[PDB]
């Protein structure tokens, strides 16, 4: 009841360019007023599985979105599958889909939805991870809170890189960050 | 309660160069022997609001200080105002000023005040944040524990940058870190 | 549950990198349910890695500290870290008995598998950057890896490396925080 997660195995659960082309591992732990998060990505097939910027010069980034409703439940237009997201039960998930998780949503006062007033950057956290664990293959992970339309809350992970990679598999090291909770 | 904060709104609470020229958003959450911290800065007026180093080549850094007494109560000569620094209640604060928060202070044995004993670097944490959320606009945030004089405990944030920015507004992305607690 | 397992915050040598007790590893693990919040720093006080000079010794560029654990989450004598002051917390010191069980502090074996011939994925690694002497122009990379050592049930390995050419620099670092998925 204190941890929402994807389960840490290697089974594809996410759709970037084609159905089930990747495995997003994401763990959210409630430490009262802040949520502690840990994330990593493995692309298993399709367009982003093996990066070759000599063959495809413009393939330099992609986005994974998690959209939630007023009760903190995952919406189906998210890249991550609904069957794969729930409160932790041992090393798996609970049997039935959860009904409420408002205490895990990014705080709307710290991070407001888009509008006409001035937009601040505190709703963004930047980090860097490394492809295949290699020190010379960095890629940036930019995480933004509550900026998508069609939902009450959102968490989006944008992955991007500036080097010209030649035949590199897109599977990453892990990164931790935290954010202020709604309740 | 488990959380000491500045509240998540954006009304000025801090004085860097002139009265209430900025909003420091700082959340301290107690997870046992460690404190989980989340910080961000928005400057709204004065000398550090808009940076132009072609015009003022020497404005390259500034500091924000938090000084506390033996009970963990904030001293009035801190750059952060005493008005809204308090334990959390919803998206605001408890009605009455707290009188004890020793469990939130940086540990004096891990981070000792200046003496003639050898000074170690472990009382420092470095992080990089981005102005306006732009990937090409980094600034470094250096956090130091218990090195100020005239107080039993202290937390100081130093912000600096090496690039020659032209009309860049100082408002940052968020950074998360942690430190060992006194009790 | 919400306990702290640590090395104590003093500065008394407690770890062996190149010679006996040449360093002080300060490591604090706190349990927050299913994740462990970690905080680490290092002070080397003697030996080969105490004062770095890559003008006279260009090849001295990295070193490794390993913490090996058995099935109950107890530290094994062959770790670089000494068993004497690695224990649960009490005030600014430790409880009076060497611990029993700490499986709730061990890195998750499904998330981070032991070596085998199955594909090895990079998620069992966390990279961080720290600074020597607190100086902004002296970085070093700290690479942390989970469960990749043999001869144990679990492990946490810290590899320290640097690419700058240092000249007579003392290896004592700022602190870094990371987290990992707990076994239970
Ligand atoms: Zn393949
Ligand atoms: Zn402005
Ligand atoms: Zn020394």
Domain chopping of chain A, boundaries: 1-183
State the first-to-last Cα distance of chain B, in angstroms, to the nearest integer: 15
Contact of A78 with A148, CB cutoff 8 Å: no
Tokens of C99: 């611990």
Tokens of A139: 């890629």
Helix residue spans in chain C (DSSP H):
none
C-alpha of residue A43 to centroid of ligand 1, in Å? 9
CB–CB contact B3 A122 (8 Å): no
Burial class (CB in 10 A: 0-12, 13-18, 19+), B179: buried
C-alpha of residue C183 to centroid of ligand 1, in Å? 29
Contact of A158 with A74, CB cutoff 8 Å: no
Fold classified for C1-184: Adenovirus Type 5 Fiber Protein (Receptor Binding Domain) (2.60.90)
CB–CB contact B124 C133 (8 Å): no
Q: What is the DSSP letter of A172?
A: B
Chains that touch A (3 or more CB pairs under 8 A): B, C
HEC assignment per residue over chain B: CCEEECCCCCCCCECCCCCCCEEEEEEEEEECCEEEEEEEEEECCCCCCEEECCCCCCCCEEEEEEEECCCCCECCCCCECCCCCEEEECCEECCCCCCCCHHHCECCCCCCCCCCCCCCHHHEEEEEEEECCCCCCEEEEEEEECCCCCCCEEEEEEEECCCCCEEEECEECCEEEEEEECC
CB–CB contact C39 B179 (8 Å): yes
CB–CB contact B120 C28 (8 Å): no
C-alpha of residue C170 to centroid of ligand 3, in Å? 6
Cα gap B172→A123, rounded to integer Å: 9
C-alpha of residue C22 to centroid of ligand 3, in Å? 10
Q: Chain A residues contacting C, CB < 8 Å?
A: 2-3, 5, 8-10, 25, 27, 29-31, 36, 38, 40, 42, 88, 91, 128-133, 135, 171-176
Q: Chain C residues contacting A, CB < 8 Å?
A: 32-35, 37, 108, 110-111, 121-127, 141, 143, 177-181
Which residues have CB under 8 Å from B55's CB, separation 6+?
none
User: Which of B88, B59, B87, B92 minimizes the C-alpha distance to B165?
Assistant: B59
Handedness of CA B158, B164, B167, B172 (dihedral sign): negative
HEC assignment per residue over C131-168: EECCCCCCEEEEEEEECCCCCCCEEEEEEEECCCCCEE
> What three-state secondary structure class fits C124?
helix
The CATH architecture one would assign to domain B1-183 is: Sandwich (2.60)
Nearby residues for ligand 3 (ion, Cβ within 5 Å): C 170
Q: Residue for token digits 């010794």?
A: C57
CA distance A149 to chain C (A): 31
Q: Chain C residues contacting B, CB < 8 Å?
A: 2-4, 6, 9-11, 26, 28, 30-32, 37, 39, 41, 43, 89, 92, 129-134, 136, 172-177
Cross-strand partners of A93: A88
Contact of C115 with C154, CB cutoff 8 Å: no
> What three-state secondary structure class fits A5?
strand
Cα gap B124→A168, rounded to integer Å: 36
Q: Residue for token digits 């940076």?
A: B51
């Amino acid at each position: 009841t204190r941890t929402l997660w994807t389960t840490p195995d290697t089974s594809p659960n996410c759709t970037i360019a084609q159905d089930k082309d990747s495995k997003l591992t994401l763990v959210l732990t409630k430490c009262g007023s802040q949520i502690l998060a840990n994330v990593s990505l493995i692309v298993v097939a399709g367009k982003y599985h093996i990066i070759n910027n000599k063959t495809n010069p413009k393939i330099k980034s992609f986005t994974i979105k998690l959209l939630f409703n007023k009760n903190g439940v995952l919406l189906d237009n998210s890249n991550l599958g609904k069957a794969y997201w729930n409160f932790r039960s041992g090393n798996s998930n609970v049997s039935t889909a959860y009904e409420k998780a408002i205490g895990f949503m990014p705080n709307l006062v710290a991070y407001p939805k888009p509008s006409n007033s001035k937009k601040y950057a505190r709703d963004i956290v930047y980090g860097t991870i490394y492809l295949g664990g290699k020190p010379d293959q960095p890629a940036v992970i930019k995480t933004t809170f509550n900026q998508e339309t069609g939902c009450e809350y959102s968490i989006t992970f944008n992955f991007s890189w500036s080097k010209t990679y030649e035949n590199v598999e897109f599977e990453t090291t892990s990164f931790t960050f935290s954010y202020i909770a709604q309740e």
